[PDB]
DNA sequence: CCCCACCCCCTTTAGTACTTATGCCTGGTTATAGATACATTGAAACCCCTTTTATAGGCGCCTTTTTTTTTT
């Protein structure tokens, strides 16, 4: 069946983002480790790497502010709570059947339930308190073998983690849980050859633009999307 | 170091008011089928042509004659 490589990708906090992360005490600070430009660049690189392989990729964001900043910047479709049934089905049908559209962004509305589509790669932008078990379930529902029976791994799960933030605490936990569940698991601190790609936020000024936008957000913007 | 108090959260479900689509029925004029106005080519139906020899009324129409009225 699907043979899944699980990885955490540890990304340093940009010093400007780390500065504010410390100073801010309300849940607003979650947005600084979520939008950290090193983490965005890692996500962007992984989408490029996998799209070159014609893999299908779902990127999960539990936070709507982040869902849009990522998807719109990377020019990928996104689905969340207010997305109409018609537009949602357009996007899912595109993901499933149109070879030009192989990456989509989905929020907490994905699990569960509408029918999560199948993919070969699942990237989680964030990690939080506290459901290790909902993560493995979603991984299981989404990931299908890329049709590479010879290969060691034919599907891929990545969880992006910001260093020096509360995100890391969730890591020793996730690693233990996933391996105990029978998964191959590793920690990636440096993505081989990100410097051969043209990724966003190469300049301090572009990072500062995003930083201003994050600082303008409120504690409400840093809550997970809730849905019943 | 231990106990008590305060702060922040997610749980999902029940209310009636408000908006959108479907069925409702309703006022023009347009598209159909056949007959009417009628007009078509077709045909049949119609009177018309050749005269005679006698009888004797009525018929209408002609130019010349006589009488009456008008004007000078």
Curated annotation (Swiss-Prot):
Cysteine pairings via disulfide bonds: none
Compartments where located: Nucleus
Null mutant phenotype: Essential, it cannot be deleted; epistasis studies suggest it is involved in damaged DNA excision repair.
Record PTM Phosphoserine, positions in chain: 203
Residue ranges annotated for the Helicase C-terminal domain, each copy included: 41-195
Role description: ATP-dependent DNA translocase. Component of the general transcription and DNA repair factor IIH (TFIIH) core complex. When complexed to CDK-activating kinase (CAK), involved in RNA transcription by RNA polymerase II. May have 3'-5' helicase activity alone, the TFIIH core however has no 3'-5' helicase activity. Also involved in transcription-coupled nucleotide excision repair (NER) of damaged DNA. In NER, TFIIH acts by opening DNA around the lesion to allow the excision of the damaged oligonucleotide and its replacement by a new DNA fragment.
Subunit structure: Component of the 7-subunit TFIIH core complex composed of XPB/SSL2, XPD/RAD3, SSL1, TFB1, TFB2, TFB4 and TFB5, which is active in NER. The core complex associates with the 3-subunit CTD-kinase module TFIIK composed of CCL1, KIN28 and TFB3 to form the 10-subunit holoenzyme (holo-TFIIH) active in transcription. An additionnal subunit, TFB6, plays a role in the dissociation of the SSL2 helicase from TFIIH after transcription initiation. Interacts directly with TFB6.
Remaining remarks: Present with 825 molecules/cell in log phase SD medium.
Family classification: Belongs to the helicase family. RAD25/XPB subfamily.
Protein name: General transcription and DNA repair factor IIH helicase/translocase subunit XPB/SSL2
Biological source species: Saccharomyces cerevisiae (strain ATCC 204508 / S288c)
Annotated gene: SSL2
């Amino acid at each position: 069946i699907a043979n899944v490589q699980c990885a955490e990708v540890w990304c340093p906090m940009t010093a400007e983002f780390y500065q504010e992360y410390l100073r801010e005490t309300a849940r607003k600070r979650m947005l600084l480790y979520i939008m950290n430009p090193t983490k965005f660049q890692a996500c962007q690189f992984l989408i490029q790497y996998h799209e070159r392989r014609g893999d299908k990729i779902i990127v999960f964001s539990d936070n709507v502010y982040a869902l849009q900043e990522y998807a719109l910047k990377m020019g990928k479709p996104f689905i969340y709570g207010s997305t109409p049934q018609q537009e949602r089905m357009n996007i899912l049908q595109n993901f499933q059947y149109n070879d030009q559209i192989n990456t989509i962004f989905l929020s907490k509305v994905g699990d569960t339930s509408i029918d999560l589509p199948e993919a070969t790669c699942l990237i989680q932008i964030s990690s939080h308190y506290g459901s290790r078990r909902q993560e493995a379930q979603r991984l299981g529902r989404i990931l299908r073998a890329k049709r590479r029976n010879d290969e060691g791994f034919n599907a891929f799960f990545y969880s992006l983690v910001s260093k020096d933030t509360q995100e890391m605490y969730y890591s020793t936990k996730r690693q233990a849980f996933l391996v105990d569940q029978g998964y191959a698991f590793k920690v990636i601190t440096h993505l081989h050859g990100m410097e051969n790609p043209n990724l966003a936020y190469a300049s301090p000024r572009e990072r500062r633009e995003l930083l201003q936008e994050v600082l303008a957000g409120i504690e409400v913007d840093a809550d997970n999307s809730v849905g019943r």
